[PDB]
Design a protein around this ligand. Sequence first.
Ligand SMILES: OC[C@H]1O[C@@H](O[C@H]2[C@H](O)[C@@H](O)[C@H](O[C@H]3[C@H](O)[C@@H](O)[C@H](O[C@H]4[C@H](O)[C@@H](O)[C@H](O)O[C@@H]4CO)O[C@@H]3CO)O[C@@H]2CO)[C@H](O)[C@@H](O)[C@@H]1O
Ligand SMILES: [Ca+2]
Ligand SMILES: [Ca+2]
Length: 347
Amino acid sequence: TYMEESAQSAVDNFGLGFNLGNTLDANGCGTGKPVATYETFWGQPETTQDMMTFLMQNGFNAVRIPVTWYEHMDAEGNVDEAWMMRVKAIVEYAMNAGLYAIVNVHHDTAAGSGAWIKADTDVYAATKEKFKKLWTQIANALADYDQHLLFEGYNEMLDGNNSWDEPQKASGYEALNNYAQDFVDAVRATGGNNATRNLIVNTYAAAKGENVLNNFMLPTDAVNNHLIVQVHSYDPWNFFNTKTTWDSECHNTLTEIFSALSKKFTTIPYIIGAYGTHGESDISVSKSSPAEKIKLAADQAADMVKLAKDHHSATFYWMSIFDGSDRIQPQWSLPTVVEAMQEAYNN
Ligand SMILES: OC[C@H]1O[C@@H](O[C@H]2[C@H](O)[C@@H](O)[C@H](O[C@H]3[C@H](O)[C@@H](O)[C@H](O[C@H]4[C@H](O)[C@@H](O)[C@H](O)O[C@@H]4CO)O[C@@H]3CO)O[C@@H]2CO)[C@H](O)[C@@H](O)[C@@H]1O
Ligand SMILES: [Ca+2]
Ligand SMILES: [Ca+2]
């Protein structure tokens, strides 16, 4: 049964969140393959009900489900039925487990080959109707799920130069803001539960610098309080390689980030939709990292979780805590990181 819930209520209920990363967002094997060829292409197992059940069983209340779509669309932009069914299936696993879930449009943005959604007015002109047709299909396919399911328009939209901090042209922000409006428009048009479903729109690059926040424009929505803004955080950049301890620089960096976010968005809720130790040369923590580096990861995660709580936000860990063959067991990959998160959330 669908029960309308405000965006802030949803965020307040997300609790500890997790990203099912490098899974349905994996891509690159080409078209015309069985669904599992995509889902396992970046070294994750096929997702099962047990994995979602495990998250709920262990103190997590929300899961972000990244999805990359471009190899699953025909020339007209129609989504392959096998692919849409699998997205539906993993969504249902999360719903069954009692979790909140987010479905997005993932490596259709950013620097990967195949990205086609870009913060560039010419790219926007060429792709706007394709983007709306995609969201119309996703919204229709997922329409009957209750308010625990949210839609996120796009992941990490960059300009045509893949500029990670800010677009090289100010009009890049216009394009982004227009995509965000088109996403909301297309979803709302499908009606039913989607008339009041909570929707998530991301900043440029999911970044949070002064210019990016000042040039973000929240879409107009005919219903009240059903929009959430999302940013990501791997800050201070490359700390996993340069630091042995989560020190005052690290702490102050995060406190200042949340201060800036809360002063920008006031009444509009926001989330940290992805965070972790991922730094230069995409190095990140694993269970074979030195103990000191695992502690560094735990301290980051605890700080992120408690600061988000203080700021009426919520957080979603990018991958590392529940990874690879550990998902099959199911067991945590990084139990000390999770213990720190749990302490931070429940106090
Ligand atoms: O380079 C490709 C790589 O980019 C990754 O994203 C990185 C950016 O590259 C990097 O420039 C960015 O650096 C942050 C830095 O970590 C923050 O500590 C610093 O913080 C400010 C904040 O911007 C202010 O809003 C706030 O008020 O104060 C704090 C503290 O002074 O801001 C800079 C950016 O200006 O970090 C990004 C990661 O978060 C991508 O993640 C990766 O995928 C790409 O390959
Ligand atoms: Ca196909
Ligand atoms: Ca607020």
